Amino acid sequence: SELLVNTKSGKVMGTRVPVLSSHISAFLGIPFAEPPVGNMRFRRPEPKKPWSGVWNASTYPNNCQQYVDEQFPGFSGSEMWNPNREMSEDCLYLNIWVPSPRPKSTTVMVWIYGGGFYSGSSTLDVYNGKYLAYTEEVVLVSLSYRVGAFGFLALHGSQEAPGNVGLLDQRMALQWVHDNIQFFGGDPKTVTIFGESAGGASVGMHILSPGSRDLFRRAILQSGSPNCPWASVSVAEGRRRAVELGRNLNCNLNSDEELIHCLREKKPQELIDVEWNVLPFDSIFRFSFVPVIDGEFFPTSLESMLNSGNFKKTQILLGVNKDEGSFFLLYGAPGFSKDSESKISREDFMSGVKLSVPHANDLGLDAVTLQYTDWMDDNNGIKNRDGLDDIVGDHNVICPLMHFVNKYTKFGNGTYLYFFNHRASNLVWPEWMGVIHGYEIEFVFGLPLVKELNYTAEEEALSRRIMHYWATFAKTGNPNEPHSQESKWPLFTTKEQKFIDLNTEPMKVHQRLRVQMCVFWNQFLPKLLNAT
Amino acid sequence: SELLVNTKSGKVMGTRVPVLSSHISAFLGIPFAEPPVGNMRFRRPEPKKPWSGVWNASTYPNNCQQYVDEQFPGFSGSEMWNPNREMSEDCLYLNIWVPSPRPKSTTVMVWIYGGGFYSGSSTLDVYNGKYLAYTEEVVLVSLSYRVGAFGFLALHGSQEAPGNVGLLDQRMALQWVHDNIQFFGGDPKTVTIFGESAGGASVGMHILSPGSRDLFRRAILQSGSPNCPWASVSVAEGRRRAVELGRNLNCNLNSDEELIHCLREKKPQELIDVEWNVLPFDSIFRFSFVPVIDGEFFPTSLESMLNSGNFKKTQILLGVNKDEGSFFLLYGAPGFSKDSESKISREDFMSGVKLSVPHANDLGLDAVTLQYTDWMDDNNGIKNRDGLDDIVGDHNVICPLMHFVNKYTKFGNGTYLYFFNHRASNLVWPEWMGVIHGYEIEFVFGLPLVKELNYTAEEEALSRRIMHYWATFAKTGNPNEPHSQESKWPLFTTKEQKFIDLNTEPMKVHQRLRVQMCVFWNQFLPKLLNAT
Numbered sequence A, B: 001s002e003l004l005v006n007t008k009s010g011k012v013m014g015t016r017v018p019v020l021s022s023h024i025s026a027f028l029g030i031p032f033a034e035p036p037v038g039n040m041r042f043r044r045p046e047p048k049k050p051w052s053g054v055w056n057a058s059t060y061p062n063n064c065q066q067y068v069d070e071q072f073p074g075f076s077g078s079e080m081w082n083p084n085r086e087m088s089e090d091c092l093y094l095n096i097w098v099p100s101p102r103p104k105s106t107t108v109m110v111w112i113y114g115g116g117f118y119s120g121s122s123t124l125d126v127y128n129g130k131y132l133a134y135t136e137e138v139v140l141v142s143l144s145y146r147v148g149a150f151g152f153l154a155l156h157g158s159q160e161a162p163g164n165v166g167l168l169d170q171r172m173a174l175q176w177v178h179d180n181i182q183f184f185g186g187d188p189k190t191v192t193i194f195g196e197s198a199g200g201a202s203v204g205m206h207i208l209s210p211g212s213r214d215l216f217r218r219a220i221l222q223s224g225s226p227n228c229p230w231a232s233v234s235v236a237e238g239r240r241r242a243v244e245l246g247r248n249l250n251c252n253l254n255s256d257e258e259l260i261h262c263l264r265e266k267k268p269q270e271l272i273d274v275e276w277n278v279l280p281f282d283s284i285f286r287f288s289f290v291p292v293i294d295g296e297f298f299p300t301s302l303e304s305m306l307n308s309g310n311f312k313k314t315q316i317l318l319g320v321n322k323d324e325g326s327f328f329l330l331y332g333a334p335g336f337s338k339d340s341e342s343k344i345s346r347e348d349f350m351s352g353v354k355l356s357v358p359h360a361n362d363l364g365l366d367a368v369t370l371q372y373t374d375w376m377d378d379n380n381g382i383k384n385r386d387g388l389d390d391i392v393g394d395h396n397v398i399c400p401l402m403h404f405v406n407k408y409t410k411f412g413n414g415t416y417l418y419f420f421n422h423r424a425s426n427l428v429w430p431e432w433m434g435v436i437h438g439y440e441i442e443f444v445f446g447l448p449l450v451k452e453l454n455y456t457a458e459e460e461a462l463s464r465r466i467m468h469y470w471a472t473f474a475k476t477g478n479p480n481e482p483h484s485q486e487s488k489w490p491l492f493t494t495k496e497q498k499f500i501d502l503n504t505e506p507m508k509v510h511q512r513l514r515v516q517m518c519v520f521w522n523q524f525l526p527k528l529l530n531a532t
């Protein structure tokens, strides 16, 4: 049967699923690791012990234990990101969508979800891989990984809670794809890993980590890069936060053994209830448990790795959205609300900048304020709101990504950069938030192709173009069709730094994406903060 | 006779001079101080001993000893500023232009020449006061004062070379006008002092200095303010430079007595030949001997005086030109030349910034560079040239003046701000220099009214408007005519900060003159330099 596949781990039984008036195969909830429960919590993943019989892969698996956003109960805008399956520590599974009839050896795309390393699920509706698998005829895989303390509590030195285990979960899933995707008709030598936000940072981290490089061919990064200020911490900070977590749960802090043992007896929700209390500053776009520069997964600092060319060299396709920062200001900066235009006063603006650049002293805060203020109209509420929006987006996503792309392009074999600036017609979030963090995903996964979702004809056309760019890049390392008549997405070169916009209007080529502000965030500010 | 005037110092005989097909009286070379020669060099001025007989005031007096610009021999552009009379230490004289018939008690305007405190003459053609005296019917006076070491060598503590004597020369001339202008038909209670560049800084210094305040009614400042970075030094720096001067002339440096005695035996030209060797940095727009914050002429720092409102409160009219910096880049920054478009490379740009902000560390230099560079086109020669031009102008003239006007307006009784941006049609300097430092003067003194000079009809109209603004302000404290139909020059208020352009086009009102860049130079940079 087309729904029965024999893998090196055992036999699996999928299910036929409808898609755009047709059908394809789906293998949901395939385990790739042993459940990381009990004494296994915080530990490196362990390969799934082979099973006899047939594994039923007809239903989605549980989502990993995580913080659940309840800011807007019932609002689809925020709940579309919450886990849609019961949560459990037994959550290391992957999902595969296979074209029908089953291909013999086609392009593979593995999706890595985002969520600030503190949340995320592979089962979200916006991540349904059938549309992309069916439309572009690629084998689409979505993996999962532990988030929060469960996946990133770091007590460097101990082997019971080494840190980065969530990244190792991802790697093991990639190892499984490498070893078994051939049986599903996928070609293991043509695997493209792609992800958004923390998922994009993750993709970049696998590009850097020597132990991950060999497991994939090409990479796509959406609104995220490994060097983002929120994507990693030092082993000292990681240790400080883990101890602080134990302190919040009345744990014995005499030794890592005592601390770890205590954290292991706690129920998942107990750790999650105090997760945000360990942050060192009053901030936004900062998460408690994230990857640590351990000297193992990451041999040295990310910066020195980027400078020496210590990373996988291949082709990459990456980009950002126009208003990456709005989500984080809505949720944590004073003055921003979901149902108002959120015109920001001067006082709230400054409160926002301190929150956005929590690691800066007063001189640094002034530098930022000066850089983003129109002194010819400093009391303009719209201008203060948008300026703060740009500050958060430039500092946390865009500039870190531009630094990465410029460093990578020096050693890489091909780079394609995009700027997503189309605001969906059916967007439920307020207008002031613009092209929101995470809203290019629905186009990448082809949601606009399903009429019931209410997108326009141009948006469906845009989704098809993007899906074809992504899939074509995955297949050849170039988003453009061989000898096509369509407009060409120019290669991003170290000299010309070209990129394109991604919207319903005719393609436009630009250069030096937000170079003015990124010279500030990547060159000046760090130099200023260090000199003081 | 109309050309004979009996003053408290003695009788004076003037001369009738033609002007625009008419005539007026001129009293040139009237002494107001004892010659500051021999043992008097460096000393505070002494009032001129009254004379018997009639002083012949029919010819211009000698110019004070000063550095003479020889960069462009024969070029009218630069030679129009060099002394046009023999130089001599015996140079403390003033000139008076009186309407004919002699007025009974009319408005008086006293001109204070600029020249970086190291040069200047009251006898320059561009300072001829007959056009203004005749056209607006005001008594126009032009004073003189010692420049260079002769007027500003400062050895705080000694009474032989206290410093600021050049400023005291100006005051004594103002004292003479106060006491004698009535005999020339001038009203001593309606005296307006005006000056350009160092002359403008001087006007602002008399506004601050308690000992000068009572000697005038109103003030006009052109391209200069007391707080300019080049307009003053501390007593320690003043002392260091004086000793360094002595060191350049093989003087005994054991004591102020030894040093001063040695400097007094030197010929004027010997001091001038090494004058520029005492500067502490490799710079531009920095002069060796300038006013010192002595705690006498200036009771405390200029900043604290401005903050506490420690200054004369009256009306003021001041402004700047569009390209104040070009002159100084032409003369001292690599890459700029008189006969080329001076497109500046990236290397020369950076050389220029270091030269323009000589007191800044590397972080400060980066801050400036970042602030004035278009990173979307950083190799644009035109953009680098103009950016450097703006850096020099903003740092040395505009921003310091904006800081002054905003501080003054808080306590003042009326402020009128202008932005002169008209490039004369007969300008001999290259196009890239734009509206040059010092070129609004010819319009203030009405040179465009004389056809032989080759200005256009609109330029003559512009000159007449400006002269009438200046004279009307001098007479009433408001540049606008009572119940006139002409466009109104709005008052500059602390809240709206309005100002007007000064050119041949219809009047336009603007707000917050170069506020974006001045927040950088007046608030951020100083804070950055101090924190490091």
Ligand SMILES: OCCOCCOCCOCCOCCOCCOCCS
Pocket (backbone or CB within 6 Å): A069, A081, A114, A115, A116, A197, A273, A276, A327, A328, A331, A437, A438
């Ligand atoms: O529980 C007590 C502590 O709570 C305080 C802090 O919690 C606030 C967390 O806010 C995080 C930011 O929220 C943004 C929501 O992002 C969801 C959409 O992201 C799309 C990309 S996967």
Ligand SMILES: OCCOCCOCCOCCOCCOCCOCCS
Pocket (backbone or CB within 6 Å): B069, B081, B114, B115, B116, B197, B273, B276, B327, B328, B331, B437, B438
């Ligand atoms: O003599 C040896 C030392 O010389 C080196 C330094 O001398 C250079 C002096 O340059 C000063 C700047 O020149 C600008 C000329 O300005 C004249 C016009 O000013 C108009 C306003 S009054």
Ligand SMILES: *[C@@H]1O[C@H](CO)[C@@H](O)[C@H](O)[C@H]1NC(C)=O
Pocket (backbone or CB within 6 Å): A056, A058, A059
């Ligand atoms: C495994 O097979 C059962 C039996 O048909 C079916 O319900 C489904 O495909 C899998 N299990 C569940 C609970 O759905």
Ligand SMILES: *[C@@H]1O[C@H](CO)[C@@H](O)[C@H](O)[C@H]1NC(C)=O
Pocket (backbone or CB within 6 Å): A412, A413, A414, A415
């Ligand atoms: C990629 O690598 C191939 C072979 O190594 C080379 O021929 C090609 O020019 C490279 N392309 C880019 C964009 O570097």
Ligand SMILES: *[C@@H]1O[C@H](CO)[C@@H](O)[C@H](O)[C@H]1NC(C)=O
Pocket (backbone or CB within 6 Å): B056, B058, B059
């Ligand atoms: C003083 O009077 C003389 C005599 O007429 C005349 O030359 C001039 O007015 C004054 N002196 C000089 C040298 O010009």
Ligand SMILES: *[C@@H]1O[C@H](CO)[C@@H](O)[C@H](O)[C@H]1NC(C)=O
Pocket (backbone or CB within 6 Å): B412, B413, B414, B415
């Ligand atoms: C100037 O002072 C007078 C009287 O002191 C006052 O009436 C007038 O309002 C003042 N004008 C300004 C602009 O301050």
